[PDB]
Design a protein around this ligand. Structure first.
Ligand code: CS
Length: 125
């Protein structure tokens, strides 16, 4: 079955199963279980610990520019529980290693065609 942009966004960024990173090993486990170390060690990736509905709602909040210059990005009005994952020095494809950083920040996502479906995670602030 084809992986839609919606499904891909959920695979790469949604973890409503936990309220926050459980430990420092969180990223290593999640990056692997979500297939983010298969085609390479995805350098950076953020997981959101909120309901899909609250993240989806961001598409109708504060409109802002995306890091790439596109105009379909949106920043959340309130802060959200998120976990930042970044490849560390001891990492080396195919043996990927990550640093886990838990936090409560505002998220910014890109909504397809400026619609209401989040398809990319731009950043957290
Ligand atoms: Cs919108």
């Amino acid at each position: 079955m084809k992986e839609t942009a919606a499904a891909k966004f959920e695979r790469q960024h949604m973890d409503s199963s936990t309220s926050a990173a459980s430990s420092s090993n969180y990223c290593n486990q999640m990056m692997k279980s979500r297939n983010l170390t298969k085609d390479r060690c995805k350098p950076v990736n953020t997981f959101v610990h909120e309901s899909l509905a609250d993240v989806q709602a961001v598409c109708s909040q504060k409109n802002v520019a995306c890091k790439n210059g596109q105009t379909n990005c949106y920043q959340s009005y309130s802060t959200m529980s998120i976990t930042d994952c970044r490849e560390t020095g001891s990492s080396k494809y195919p043996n990927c290693a990550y640093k886990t950083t838990q936090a409560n920040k505002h998220i910014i996502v890109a909504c397809e065609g400026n619609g209401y479906v989040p398809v990319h995670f731009d950043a957290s602030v």
